[PDB]
Symmetry: C2
Subunit: 405 residues, 2 copies
């Protein structure tokens, strides 16, 4: 299957898509919050627990060798899918938020001091804001925020103007989870390096929607969450260039990250072990590897083109409903279609849509600053994935129209 | 105690190694899962999967119900007074790092003293060493006798007016020693310290009542109590949590974010940054219900019988020395064999189908205290049998009667 792309064939792999809501078909437009899982991922987890479950270290015994094989294969699946040079540059942790906190606490506390500057974009999710605020109060570093225009495009000229001799770190989202804006990460990384800064890229909403090649990109850190790319909850990745991880001290301490422990002093292993303390989340890493293989079978460029067709279809029909204002109309977008409706609270629109079976989020989407920049406290945010259909979009448009009338 | 009916629930127990039935004596590293836990995870992914916040939409409400019920199952099972005292994270190691970085960062300064025991797992050593090196806090280690018993007089002699924290294991993963945690807590409190209890090896083997114990913190890992990987718990008394600043920052733990500053939620949200591992918490709740149906006092009695049966029969083999003969033990039976290195013994046992750990068990200091670099360590769980113990005893005696190294 999936030699040719067909959305009904694809949808058939996702069991929850046959679920019913209030007597109506489920329409999952909440992909920017989390995605639904293919049967192969569910079955990969079941198979691991029934046939492979153990802590790792292949010399121990048979099941330990099975679990070790699966864990190493999962790390390699991540390395291959994002184009990292080495599996030693792939760190498993719980998700994007833990990965950014790792970089902030460990790398930031080692390298930042008073007056040093961190540049983030106005488009950031809270996961890429709060850790820099914590670090900035701890170290005296100054946090600068690169601005956007009213359509939500990052302004590259103002961004370059914020860079200077005090710039040590740029942390930028590749895809805004609230507006859908795609940012020019190649340019951001090149500019950051030109001024001597390390560059972290928040890829939680780019990795499901466009091909990623971190080696070509050159970013020093790249982070994402497994549950937003059809994988299990509880698993995510920090990619770090070998030289960036070498200058990052250990963060969490305990088993696996040590080479030798005495009561007076411990020595630490190299990466990836250096940053993985305690028993890893072995089963969900293995499930994430299965999710990556599923996405590769379908094809990330085919996913990107199909999802682009969905967004291109939905946006004008939504915008033509009287009272609707689209929020986020950047030159390039992926998946997310925030809007508001005059005279109606976003949350009541979300609840009416749920009454139609349609799942969306209405709220600030853990991105209050960008919404305030747009003059708003909340938006209604359908977000599309490659198992969504044009027919589902039609149902959603009719529902919004009936609310507006 | 019907071990055969219980064994029927664990599918992996049907696996074979070298054409021989698997014998899982590696429970101190991780446990195997009942089909109810595996199925609970599958059911979640196929029918309930969503981020939380029940007002959003139907699946979000299903996910919120399941996550709240998991937190309440943990609260009930460990005897905590409030669900707000239960923090979900990856495992024991993350929980201890939370207390060390956040509580310790605020409360352990130059000259303040930390008391741990000689029995600690690396997870309850390295975080205190890292904190100590950051702040000038002083780490003291309470000794044991040659049998592996905690010496209560010497422990109390370590306490004084500068003791801020006692961090003690309840059950040693390398020796099986059960420590007198009620005495430890009462003594620490008398001298003015908070007390953290490492329960990763006590919670599967004996009843836990943290409100009656009075411990300030209690930590454990889901995968050592028949649950999924990637999930564990920090319990903290609400007054202890009230004096603990946030650790990781991001979504869920904030109440409001502006570019200037972020305000934080109260507990448990305060300590859970980002998307939680919803599915594995749900699976851990299912594991807790399984243990509760069997009965933790019945499990404790049966496992005590297993250990009592095994210890003299293993000790009677010429060449064998038992490592850890404390007055009260649970699960673990470390030993060494003259003329054989532990790892080779472990591999030979695996050739017979028997899974054990051979090594330092992430507890190098206690093994050095015993004069050793490594031990062979079977550890028993309530799906193990006397027959499996007989196979193990015969395999050890064949190794002992064979050629030395």
């Amino acid at each position: 299957r999936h030699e040719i792309f067909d959305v009904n064939a694809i949808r058939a792999d996702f069991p929850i898509l046959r679920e019913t809501v209030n007597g109506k078909p489920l329409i999952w437009f909440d992909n920017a919050a989390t995605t639904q899982k293919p049967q192969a991922v569910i079955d990969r987890l079941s198979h691991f627990y029934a046939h492979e479950n153990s802590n790792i270290h292949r010399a121990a015994h048979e099941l330990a060798a099975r679990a070790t094989d699966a864990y190493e294969d999962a790390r390699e699946a991540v390395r291959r899918f994002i184009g990292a040079a080495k599996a030693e540059e792939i760190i498993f942790l719980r998700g994007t938020t833990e990965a950014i906190n790792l970089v902030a606490h460990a790398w930031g506390g080692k390298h930042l001091g008073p007056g040093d500057e961190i540049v983030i974009t106005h488009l950031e999710h809270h996961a890429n804001i709060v850790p820099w605020q914590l670090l900035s109060r701890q170290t005296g570093a100054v946090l600068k925020v690169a601005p956007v225009d009213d359509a939500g495009n990052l302004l590259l000229g103002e961004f370059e103007d914020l860079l200077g001799p005090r710039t040590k770190l740029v942390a930028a989202t590749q895809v805004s989870n609230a507006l859908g804006t795609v940012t020019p990460v190649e340019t951001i990384v090149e500019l950051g390096h030109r001024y001597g800064a390390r560059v972290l890229i928040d890829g939680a909403q780019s990795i499901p929607h466009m091909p990623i090649d971190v080696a070509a990109l050159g970013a020093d850190f790249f982070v994402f969450s497994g549950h937003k790319i059809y994988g299990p909850t509880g698993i995510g990745v920090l990619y770090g260039r070998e030289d960036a991880l070498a200058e990052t001290p250990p963060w969490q301490g305990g088993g696996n990250m040590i080479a030798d422990v005495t009561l007076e002093r411990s020595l630490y292993q190299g990466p990836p072990n250096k940053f993985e303390a305690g028993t890893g989340n072995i089963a969900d890493a293995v499930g994430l590897g299965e999710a990556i293989r599923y996405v590769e079978r379908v094809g990330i460029e085919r996913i990107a083109a199909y999802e682009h067709a969905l967004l291109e279809y939905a946006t004008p029909r939504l915008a033509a409903i009287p009272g609707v204002r689209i929020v986020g109309t950047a030159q390039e977008k992926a998946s997310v279609l925030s809007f508001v409706l005059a005279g109606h609270e976003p949350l009541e629109v979300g609840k009416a849509l749920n009454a139609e079976g349609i799942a969306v989020r209405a709220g600030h989407h853990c991105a209050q600053p960008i919404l305030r920049r747009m003059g708003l406290e909340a938006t209604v945010r359908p977000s599309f994935a490659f198992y969504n259909t044009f027919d589902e979009i039609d149902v959603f448009i009719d529902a919004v129209r009936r609310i507006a009338e």
